[PDB]
DNA sequence: GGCGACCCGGCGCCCGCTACGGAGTCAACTACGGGTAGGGGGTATCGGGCAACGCGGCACTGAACACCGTTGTCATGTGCCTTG
């Protein structure tokens, strides 16, 4: 996980933590689990590295209803949409050219120069209903 | 043949401190052979110089709620006037 800044142990540690975690997480709870591992990193520094990862683009970023920004990394480079369960957090990556063509067609119809789509589908889990 | 002088060796010492001069010297040679040590040449290893980047207080982000404060508001109750 290369970063724009000079490599060191702490960015490697947070990158490895993101690698192990395959769920949507917030910065504060990410720091909580990171401290639980025992690295004892700083809050604001963790912010810098996660922000850098979001800027780099190798980690997707989502915004919750509460307004918190949450992050998680994706195995595949190409763009995709993550279906996520609020209770579980199971993020599954899917993509469809139909929505892309729809966006381009709308942009052309309205004479828009450039666009950027943000589509996230929320829903109820299959196993959450079961008990 | 122990005494005896005597003889000889052999040794022992020979007041105190400061303060006060220098001086320094006569008779082989070569060949080899190694080994250490020096020199430079090149090389792995340690040490010195810079911005992010760890942190933390608080600060802003006010956003999003909460805490009283307020004049919105309502359907529903007294007091006077008209008619039983
Ligand atoms: Zn993604
Ligand atoms: Zn998409
Ligand atoms: Zn679920």
Answer yes or no: do A72 and A93 share one domain: no
Distance of CA A131 to the CA centre of its chain: 29
Lookup: nucleotide whose C1' is closest to A41 CA: B54
Q: Which residues sit opposite A23 in a β-bridge?
A: A90
Cα dihedral A19, A67, A81, A123 sign: positive
Q: Beta-carbon neighbour count of residue A81 at 10 Å?
A: 17
HSE (side-chain half, CA atoms, 13 Å) at A39: 20
Are residues A73 and A112 both part of a single domain? no
Q: Per DSSP, what are the bridge partners of residue A94?
A: A81
Q: Resolution, in Å, please? A: 3.5
C-alpha separations of A28 from A36, A64, A69 in Å: 12, 14, 10
Q: Measured on CA atoms in the order A106, A110, A111, A114, is the torsion positive or negative? A: negative
Secondary structure in 3-state letters for A3-45: CCCCCCHHHHHHHHHHHHCCECEEHHHHHHHHHHHCCCCCHHH
Give counts: helices (H), strands (E), chain A: 5, 6
Tokens matching residue A103: 């966006």
CB-contacted nucleotides of strand B (7 Å): 51-57, 63-64
Range of the domain at A75: 1-79
Q: Please name the method used to determine this structure.
A: cryo-EM
**Residue A64 and residue A42 share a domain:** yes
């Amino acid at each position: 996980p290369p970063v724009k800044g000079r490599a060191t142990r702490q960015r490697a540690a947070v990158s490895a933590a993101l690698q192990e975690v395959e769920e949507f997480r917030s910065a504060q709870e990410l720091h909580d689990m990171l401290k639980h591992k025992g690295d004892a990193v700083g809050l604001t520094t963790v912010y810098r590295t996660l922000q850098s990862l979001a800027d780099a683009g190798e980690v997707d970023v989502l915004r919750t209803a509460e307004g918190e920004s949450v992050y998680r990394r994706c195995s595949t480079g190409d763009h995709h949409h993550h279906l996520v369960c609020r209770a579980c957090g199971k993020a599954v990556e899917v993509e469809g050219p139909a929505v892309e063509k729809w966006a381009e067609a709308i942009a052309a119809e309205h004479g828009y120069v450039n666009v950027a789509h943000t589509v996230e589908i929320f829903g109820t889990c299959a196993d959450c209903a079961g008990a």
